[PDB]
Amino acid sequence: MIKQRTLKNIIRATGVGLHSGEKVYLTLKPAPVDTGIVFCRTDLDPVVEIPARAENVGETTMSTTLVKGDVKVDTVEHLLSAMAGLGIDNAYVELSASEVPIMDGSAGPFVFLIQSAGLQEQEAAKKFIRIKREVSVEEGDKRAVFVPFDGFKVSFEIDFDHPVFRTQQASVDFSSTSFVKEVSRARTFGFMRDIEYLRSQNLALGGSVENAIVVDENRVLNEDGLRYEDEFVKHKILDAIGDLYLLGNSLIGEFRGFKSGHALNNQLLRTLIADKDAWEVVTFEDARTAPISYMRP
Ligand SMILES: CC#CCOc1ccc(C(=O)N[C@H](C(=O)NO)C(C)(C)N)cc1
Ligand SMILES: [Zn+2]
């Protein structure tokens, strides 16, 4: 069988929230079978747990935020993209603040911290969600779609009227290309002109060339340039993988994004969940037959 996975050992990371600018401690802890991903705010008294599920998504303005009453966990998408890429089903995510650390702006440091500690396969089948029919959400010129596909594929299109914006479309098939090599290192991006407005709203407070691609009026400000020729659209793919992982199970299908973001990604998940005839929970007794393959633990 394709087994569920958790962490072999507890791992720790320190960083700052991209939007809050606040120092934060992140701890990833091994979790038992069928736990899912659960956030734990250890700076609160009492401590608050927020399961990483589509129903707990409260805000989608700049990042995906989880909410439980008056308690929040901001910018969960890059850590969840790393967990989805590596096939982590169960984990406790302890945070000392309301925002996950931005690290270098990509999923790269999270992928490394997890792979350093290593993965533990658990004696229970991994549950997948197969897309049986097309599900789509549109709002204005923005669109987010699930199409049946025997594997996992992400297609994305962005349309920025800026001189820096190169390849604005990309399609990644996870049967042909690894998450680690092709997507994990794609950093988040911001426009210098927006950062001014964002900081007046207490947003992007921790943003810098150290954790983001910073775009000027005509070029990338970062001394060392880009990690990929199409790093902007590859980061949008990284975000969709993370937002989609809030479904709580790995998807077997194709995601297509057209100028979409966190808000529409969550709306698509909400529509899929509601449209129960569009999907089915499946397990694979033989990994040789399975449409999605994961790296050895
Ligand atoms: C100096 C300096 C600086 C950096 O400042 C910012 C400001 C905002 C963002 C942001 O909103 N990013 C989003 C993201 O990746 N959500 O996961 C994205 C790409 C979907 N809009 C990123 C960096
Ligand atoms: Zn992002």
Domains for the chain: give ranges and CATH numbers: 1-127 (3.30.230.20), 128-297 (3.30.1700.10)
Best residue among 188, 193, 223, 266 to mutate for probing ligand 1, ranked by most atoms within 8 Å of CB: 188
Q: Is the Cβ–Cβ distance between 198 and 61 less than 8 Å?
A: no
In sequence order, what DSSP letters do the residues of 32-66 get, joined into one string? Answer: -TT--EEEEETTSSS-EEEE--GGGEEE-SSS-EE
Q: Exposed (0-12), middle (13-18) or buried (19+): which is 40, by Cβ within 10 Å? A: middle
- Is the Cα dihedral 4, 127, 172, 141 positive or negative? negative
Dihedral-angle region of residue 279 (phi above 0 means left; psi in -120 to 50 means alpha; beta otherwise): beta
For residue 145, give the DSSP letter. Answer: E
Question: Does the Cβ of 117 fall within 6 Å of ligand 1?
Answer: no
The resolution of the experimental structure, rounded to one decimal in Å, is 2.0
CA atoms within 13 A on the CB side of 81: 34
Written as six digits, the tokens of 169 are: 């479309």
Q: 234 CA distance to ligand 2 centroid (A)?
A: 10
Q: Is the Cβ–Cβ distance between 93 and 56 less than 8 Å?
A: no
Question: Does the Cβ of 50 fall within 6 Å of ligand 1?
Answer: no
Q: 5 CA distance to ligand 2 centroid (A)?
A: 24
Residues 6+ apart with CB under 8 A from 40: 47, 48, 49, 50, 92, 93, 94, 95
Q: 203 CA distance to ligand 1 centroid (A)?
A: 10
Q: Which residues is 256 bridged to in the sheet?
A: 145, 155
Q: Exposed (0-12), middle (13-18) or buried (19+): which is 118, by Cβ within 10 Å? A: exposed
Residues 242 and 240: their CA atoms lie apart, in Å, by 5
Alpha carbon separation from 248 to 51, 86, 108, 204, 281 (Å, rounded): 9, 14, 22, 28, 11
Residues 6+ apart with CB under 8 A from 137: 143, 144, 145, 264, 267, 268, 271
Q: Is the Cβ–Cβ distance between 259 and 159 less than 8 Å?
A: yes
The experimental method, as deposited, was X-ray
Q: Whose CA is nearest to atom 4 of ligand 1?
A: 207
The environment of the single-atom ion ligand 2, i.e. residues with CB closer than 5 A, is 188, 239
Catalytic residue among 262, 263, 264, 265: 262
